[PDB]
Amino acid sequence: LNIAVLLGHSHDVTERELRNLWGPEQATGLPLDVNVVALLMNRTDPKSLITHVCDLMSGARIHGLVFGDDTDQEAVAQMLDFISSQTFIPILGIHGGASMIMADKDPTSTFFQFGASIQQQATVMLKIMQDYDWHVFSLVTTIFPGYRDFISFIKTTVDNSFVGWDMQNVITLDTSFEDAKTQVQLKKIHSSVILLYCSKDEAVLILSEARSLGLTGYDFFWIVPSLVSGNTELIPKEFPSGLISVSYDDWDYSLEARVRDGLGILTTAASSMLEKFSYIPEAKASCYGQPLHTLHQFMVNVTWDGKDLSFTEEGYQVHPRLVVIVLNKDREWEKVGKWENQTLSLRHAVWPRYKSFSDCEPDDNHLSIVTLEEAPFVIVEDIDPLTETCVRNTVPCRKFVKINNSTNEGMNVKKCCKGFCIDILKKLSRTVKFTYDLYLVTNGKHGKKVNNVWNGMIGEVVYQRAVMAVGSLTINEERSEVVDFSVPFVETGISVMVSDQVTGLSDKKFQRPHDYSPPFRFGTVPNGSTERNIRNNYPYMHQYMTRFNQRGVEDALVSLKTGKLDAFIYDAAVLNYKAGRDEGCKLVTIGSGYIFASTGYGIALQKGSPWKRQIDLALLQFVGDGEMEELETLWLTGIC
Amino acid sequence: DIQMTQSPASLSVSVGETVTITCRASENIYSNLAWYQQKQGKSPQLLVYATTNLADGVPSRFSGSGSGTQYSLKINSLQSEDFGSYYCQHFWGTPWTFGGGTKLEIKRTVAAPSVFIFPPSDEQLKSGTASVVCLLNNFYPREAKVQWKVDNALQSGNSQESVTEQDSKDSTYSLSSTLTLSKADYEKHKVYACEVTHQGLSSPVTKSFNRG
Amino acid sequence: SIHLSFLRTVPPYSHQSSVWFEMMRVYNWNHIILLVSDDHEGRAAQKRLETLLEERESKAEKVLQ
Amino acid sequence: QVTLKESGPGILQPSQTLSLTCSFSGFSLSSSGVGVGWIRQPSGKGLEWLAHIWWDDIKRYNPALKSRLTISKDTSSSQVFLKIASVATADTATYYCTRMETAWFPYWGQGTLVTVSAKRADARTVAAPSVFIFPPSDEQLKSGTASVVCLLNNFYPREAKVQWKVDNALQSGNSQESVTEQDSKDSTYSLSSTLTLSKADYEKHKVYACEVTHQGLSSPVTKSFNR
Amino acid sequence: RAQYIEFSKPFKYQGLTILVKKEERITGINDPRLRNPSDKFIYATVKQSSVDIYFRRQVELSTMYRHMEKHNYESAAEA
């Protein structure tokens, strides 16, 4: 029937294109009085809206007056609620003041807003925060409607989530601040995530106070709900670049994108419930003097174009098509993803560093660490799928494993792992207090100067611009001439572990393998430091290990547990880690690793990096405070 | 940043002789240097990467060697398909600075610079400008020092020297220095000379003309 | 919450519940029953009642409608 | 196979944001290796490296241009959109997006022309070519080799392929397209040429011509040669 | 030591142990027999040595750090 699209937004869009929208939107001959109109509220005052409503009601009892604006205002929401309670008309809130979610709505009111509710916003922001492993949050509410329900939902989400969440004191902004009783509260806030549940002007004032009192840093990530960013044409300058704005709509989902959907839902409800009420457009005569089978609460189940646009008891889209965007550098909303009805469809899974949020931020303390798959080091595992999250002890590693060889798609799953390097980076970030970007990319193995072929994590850390790497490998020639390793925290060197009568590597059975010790599988892992060391020391032994090259570390362990592998030459730490879990203590380390190579594990740093001194001091403090025995007892668990 | 000081572009090597592109380095000592070759209008094609291996579609005569700070590109057989500017781009440090450009040519050309200065016609004088163009042609040495001496005064800062592409038939160059002046400035001066200091010309040729 | 500036000079249901709770602690009326049939304001009434009971280090038995 | 294509606004005013796009097909940008990297080369100078993005979607700009250089990519459409604000005449260069991997050979693309200038190709008067003929006299080539050249001055569109006597004397030893235009100060260019013709041709009923076919603003001006 | 001067590449990768004359056994330093010794249970120690710095940097052996002041020597040869 008649679709009164009262667009009260400030933009003067051509309303002539709205009359011809009946064709593609279910053009049926059942509605007779299809009086499609469109107005443009210029003056932003309740009086103009009241006059427009009273004029439209006199126009042959116009029913179903869909209203929408461009800026969310608390006055327009209350006015539309009063209109829907008095006139009892199924209004459809599209955007602006028509979509301002309130705390407690009227039961008889048919205010059907489009977008996400406060609980849905809390859920999606909790998902976004847990996808980046951010548990230190600070909730700040205000006097606007929707604070008690919001804090209740937050407390409920924290209770069921058993992965740890720093619940700091909630700051209330119900009263006006005078910079005498709120600065002390804002100073105590030390969490990274800053939940700012306020309005536009209040958020601007909070950002101004943070910039004037020295609260804006490279670690404070402000998050605002859809109430703050309720528009796509006005962006203040106080908000820095990187403000996560979870808005229910953007420039893609403009007014015209929802007008057609609302008209389709309305005409579908009319065609469905027309057999009950013949005269559907029955409203009051005018504004002077003036639910059984109407169309008031019978349009909360129309599924338009497959979208789950069902309304709740108060009226709100249960599964909206909200788009989560952030703030770019040139005062524009840069899209990073959206949220589907099933789960969170985060397009930009890699969170940017954002070393400079605002213009006056010269501090750059964002680093990056690269790690690979190693047997003696942290074992690569998967994230716990019982809650799609993990714990703080398991640092989420950004994996890069592909599905197939011919395919180019790389799964950037946020899997968490625990181990030696994980604890190293944890204690480093706890003592040195720096930010890192850890990622586990599928690479090769240890690279060296063989035909200038650099692969694996070694090839990555050889070049500059790389901060550091948790992988502390054996000391070599090229890996020490290219980059400057830190102090070796361990003294384990290269030795041999035969799976009794031998004297290590000084036995005469290696120089002449013809009579004694016939040539067997004596090779090490392909492209390893031991190969280079032997080639530099013994050419014939290197040729023998090359012509008898074995498989990886796991196959070497399987062969050692079987008995076919004679000897396994590697670092003493790896040999001790392997012997710590022997299946009967069969293989024994013949000679420790201090008479053959006497190497160590040095952190792969950058040549001429300012963080080298800090890493060296951190290592000397960690191995110079009396916890070396504790580390040896915790990591090395050799019982045999 | 790693200051890359490539050999000057004025390196002419005839067909058959060896080419030694001396692209020096800076205090930051590196180990990998990828050589490239940018032709006329085409894209720079990588010939030898890391100065140790060859790429697909690169002849075997392009050999690279050198360590420390002195890196050279040994060209065994110089052919006609080796035309183009050569650069020494390193991927070792963070700033991937390029080279100066190695322009190889044939040092076999005996010509005489065609010094012919042309005064502006009356059509240009009606607008209000007067651009004298001392056109040069048929000269192999690009290092041409044209000295505009208008009324016994060396002009500087108003010479529009535009170098052209070297031809393959005669292997020469052309130069058209534009004397950017106006009608009022042209009416003040009387004699306009064009003294070009060229290597082949022993005596400086000074072509002058009188107005009217 | 929903009304920014809305005051009155008449005791609402919350003040009545507070007065009832104050009269209950005088005669040691801890285990009481609530027969509130209304829903809209009855929900807030029973919420205030149970919160005050929890603040009195006790808990009622019937606070539901 | 590995194919590259560079697109973007050719003529754009300075102090704005470009719309560069590096379209490609066959490979990706987050496929454990091959990525993309922007490389520009100004006219008359060497190439310049601004920034590049790796497979793990990490950004790293240049210290000297750490005010507007913002690199961005997309894995759904396989496009590389570069945003450079506050541009000027010094940023006029041919941007390239080639391979920056340690593989056998890095692949390079054709490239797009990006001329940053405030003037337009269809300007009022600073874009129209001004043919300036040079009548020969008896003081320079009275006994040597004669020469004639039509001088084009105060024209913005440098794409002016003047063909001397199309199908008549095009192969008479001319280098119009070979001589690069000289960029003047007032956002204009200036090119010249040379012709190897004997002085006796001017008298033996042989008058040359200069048909300026300027495709920038479609100006088919024609000026004859006289003495 | 890293605050004033720096170090070089370590050449002798060794540790720190106790010399016994084999309560006859000492089973390290974590045992309470030597962790909190008496006036007549002080072993050999060298003043201004590596062991002194190790006892000073320790956080749980402060009660033993003061007890070692009785048998401080000028060199290791005396001990």
Say yes or no for a CB contact (<8 Å) between A625 and E57. Answer: yes
Q: How far apart are CA B125 and CA B145, in angstroms?
A: 28
Sequence length of chain A is: 640
Place of tokens 């990297």: D37
Q: What angle do CA A527, A532, A535 make, to 5 degrees?
A: 125
Tokens of C12: 């609402």
- Residue numbers in B near D189 (CB within 8 A): none
Q: SS3 of A605, please?
A: strand
Following DSSP, what letter does each residue of A2-34 receive, concatenated? --EEEE--SS---GGGGGGGGTTTT--SS----
Smallest CA–CA distance, residue B43 to chain D, in Å, is 6
Whether D119 contacts D13, CB under 8 Å: no
Nearest Cα neighbor of B160 from B181, B141, B143 is B181
Which residue from B minimizes the CA distance to A462?
B92
Say yes or no for a CB contact (<8 Å) between B52 and A463. Answer: no
Q: How far apart are CA D81 and CA D72, in angstroms?
A: 6
Place of tokens 């001990």: E79
D27 touches chain A (CB under 8 A): yes
Say yes or no for a CB contact (<8 Å) between B94 and A465. Answer: yes
Which residue from D minimizes the CA distance to A408?
D31
Q: SS3 of A538, please?
A: coil
Burial category of B178 from C-beta neighbours within 10 Å (exposed 0-12, middle 13-18, buried 19 and up)? buried
Phi, psi torsion values for E52, nearest 5 degrees: -65, -45
As a three-state string, the secondary structure of D96-156 is EEECCCCCCCCCCCCCCCCEECCCCCCCCCCCCCEEECCCCCCCCCCCCCECCCCEEEEEC
Any residues with CB less than 8 A from the CB of A172 and at least 6 apart, and which?
A140, A141, A142
Say yes or no for a CB contact (<8 Å) between D32 and A330. Answer: no
Say yes or no for a CB contact (<8 Å) between A626 and E60. Answer: yes
Facing A464 at nearest CB: one of B31, B53, B93: B93
Whether A93 contacts A33, CB under 8 Å: no
Q: Pairing mode, if any, of strands A494-498 and A567-571? A: antiparallel
Place of tokens 């100004």: D42
Resolution of the model in angstroms: 7.7
Count interface pairs A-E at CB distance under 8 A: 24
Q: SS3 of B187, please?
A: helix
Which residue from D minimizes the CA distance to A460?
D102
Following DSSP, what letter does each residue of A229-298 receive, concatenated? S--SS---SSS-TT-EEEES--SSS-HHHHHHHHHHHHHHHHHHHTTT-S------S-SS----SSSSSS
Q: How far apart are CA E46 and CA A162, in angstroms?
A: 53
Gaps in chain E with C–N over 2.5 Å, residue before each: 22
B149-160 burial, b for 16+ CB within 10 Å, e for fewer? ebeeeeeeeeeb
- Residue numbers in E near A493 (CB within 8 A): 13
B127 touches chain D (CB under 8 A): yes
Q: How far apart are CA A126 and CA A124, in angstroms?
A: 5
Say yes or no for a CB contact (<8 Å) between A465 and B52. Answer: no
Say yes or no for a CB contact (<8 Å) between D49 and B43. Answer: no
Nearest Cα neighbor of B130 from B91, B196, B181 is B181
C6 touches chain A (CB under 8 A): no
- Residue numbers in D near A412 (CB within 8 A): 30
Sheet containing D189-191: order of strands: D130-132, D151-155, D189-191
Q: How far is CA B176 from CA A85, A140, B159, in A?
A: 85, 72, 10
Q: How far is CA E1 from CA A624, E4, E47, E53, E65, in A?
A: 11, 6, 17, 10, 19
Q: How far apart are CA A302 and CA A272, in angstroms?
A: 10
Q: SS3 of B82, please?
A: helix
- Residue numbers in A near E7 (CB within 8 A): 487
Q: Pairing mode, if any, of strands B45-46 and B34-38? A: antiparallel
Question: Using beta carbons and an 8 Å cutoff, which residues of A are at the interface with E?
Answer: 487-488, 491, 493, 594, 598, 600, 616-617, 620, 624-626, 629
- Residue numbers in E near A620 (CB within 8 A): 2
Smallest CA–CA distance, residue D54 to chain A, in Å, is 12
Q: Assign 3-state DSSP to chain E and report helix, strand, coil percentages, each to 5.
A: 25, 5, 70
Nearest Cα neighbor of B57 from A362, C63, D107 is D107
Q: How far apart are CA A322 and CA A340, in angstroms?
A: 8
What single-letter amino acid sits at B83? F
Q: How far apart are CA A375 and CA A551, in angstroms?
A: 13
E33 known member of a binding site: no
Q: How far apart are CA E60 and CA A627, in angstroms?
A: 11
Q: Which residues of A are annotated as a binding site for L-glutamate?
A: 472, 474, 479, 529-530, 571
Facing D56 at nearest CB: one of A348, A353, A439: A439
Whether B64 contacts B51, CB under 8 Å: yes
- Residue numbers in B near D145 (CB within 8 A): 114, 116
Which residue from D minimizes the CA distance to A463?
D102
Q: Pairing mode, if any, of strands B159-160 and B173-182? A: antiparallel
Q: SS3 of A337, please?
A: strand
Residues facing residue B146 across a β-bridge? B196
State the chains in contact with E (3 or more Cβ–Cβ pairs under 8 Å): A
Facing D147 at nearest CB: one of B91, B116, B131: B116
CB atoms within 10 A of CB A640: 10
Say yes or no for a CB contact (<8 Å) between D31 and A408. Answer: yes
For CA atoms B1, B7, B10, B12, the dihedral sign is: negative
Facing B135 at nearest CB: one of D48, D109, D192: D192
Q: Which of residues 45 through 64 in chain B touch D, CB cutoff 8 A?
A: 45-46, 49, 55-58
Q: Which residues of A are annotated as a binding site?
A: 11, 95, 233, 249, 472, 474, 479, 529-530, 571
Substitution target from A452, A461, A480, A481 for chain B, most B beta carbons within 10 A? A452
Place of tokens 């450079």: D84
Rg (CA), chain A: 34
Whether A429 contacts A442, CB under 8 Å: no
Whether B11 contacts B34, CB under 8 Å: no
Which residue from B minimizes the CA distance to A451?
B52
CB atoms within 10 A of CB A374: 18
Substitution target from D57, D59, D65 for chain A, most A beta carbons within 10 A? D57
Residues facing residue B175 across a β-bridge? B136, B163
Phi, psi torsion values for A15, nearest 5 degrees: -85, 0
Facing D32 at nearest CB: one of A398, A410, A454: A410
Q: Which residues of A are annotated as a binding site for Zn(2+)?
A: 11, 95, 233, 249
Smallest CA–CA distance, residue A625 to chain B, in Å, is 37
CB atoms within 10 A of CB A208: 12
Any residues with CB less than 8 A from the CB of A128 and at least 6 apart, and which?
A223, A244, A246, A324, A344, A346
Q: Which of residues 68 through 107 in chain B touch D, CB cutoff 8 A?
A: 87, 89, 91, 94-101
Whether A39 contacts A52, CB under 8 Å: yes
Residues facing residue D155 across a β-bridge? D189
Smallest CA–CA distance, residue A470 to chain B, in Å, is 21
Whether D111 contacts D52, CB under 8 Å: no
Helix A611-622 × helix A420-431 angle, to 10°: 110
Place of tokens 């076999």: B108
Method used to obtain the model: cryo-EM
Smallest CA–CA distance, residue B58 to chain A, in Å, is 18
